[PDB]
Design a protein around this ligand. Sequence first.
Ligand code: RED
Ligand code: K
Ligand code: K
Ligand code: ZN
Length: 354
Amino acid sequence: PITGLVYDQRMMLHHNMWDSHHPELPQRISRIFSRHEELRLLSRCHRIPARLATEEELALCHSSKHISIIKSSEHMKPRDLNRLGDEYNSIFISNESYTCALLAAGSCFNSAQAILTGQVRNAVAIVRPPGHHAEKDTACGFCFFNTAALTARYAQSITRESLRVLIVDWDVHHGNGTQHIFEEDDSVLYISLHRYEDGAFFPNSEDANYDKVGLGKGRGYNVNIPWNGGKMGDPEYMAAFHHLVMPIAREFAPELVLVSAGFDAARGDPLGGFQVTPEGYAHLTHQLMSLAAGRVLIILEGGYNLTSISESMSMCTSMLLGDSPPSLDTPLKTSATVSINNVLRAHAPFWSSL
Ligand SMILES: O=C(O)CCCC[C@@H](S)CCS
Ligand SMILES: [K+]
Ligand SMILES: [K+]
Ligand SMILES: [Zn+2]
């Protein structure tokens, strides 16, 4: 019953040289790491070493051209870096961005390998920059490479190609890159909960709507849970897991669970506008541990209130270590019931448990 943890100072080197107060702060990971220390959770975890992902490992999900542009950014001058960063949707680049993204991916490869070989039962990855917005051919939303998507492909590469991986994305923003990478894939089930607002919330695409169920062989293996009309919180995420996430995940019977654990849906986040409490994230973590014989990897994504994400991820690590879930504090808002009902009707054809 061992819980793994990976963290490396070197992932702080990715920074915004023009906007030092940019919300994707280097201190995001150190604040989460520091909160684990003062809560005495760090000494109960097994430290997993970080490492750089290889370019061949990046090719599992990303085109060679995209890898080369970011690899070339390591030697650019400040003026070249600003022009290149501005060519993407919400991306800043420094000379250390490429190495930090390599470390974030490679840190998750070691964690998945530790889980899949039984060295640890579950693991948490405090990494940056995030990954779930990165597409096959371009960077997006502070993400350069899709760390969660790469880890799923890496997990299959060290087991079997058809290894069933469930990716739960509870980051408040839709993982557009993760959806597109596995859109035609039946071996990687993608479930995302996200603020939608009829496509007005970032990343501002109708690909995040409930009717996108996957394509080809992947039909039914892409579950979007979009929220519309107002500040969502614990009761809405509790209901979505009870009605949609947990029934679909159990029928899928995953062999590995990856959590794109963004904490920008948390109370107090300056970007999400939601009110999910640290206890809420703990209960969601506890429910996912009932899958894949407890083989759960928590990967940091978004989340930009330093105090909120520190408490929230530490609560998740507390669940992986076996602690009992803390008790929650409300009737579902009408629009939330409407959203859950739309997903149920869209995915009932594919999941008899619905
Ligand atoms: O457009 C917005 O609503 C603000 C920026 C979006 C935040 C994204 S870029 C964070 C990725 S987890
Ligand atoms: K999401
Ligand atoms: K899929
Ligand atoms: Zn986000």
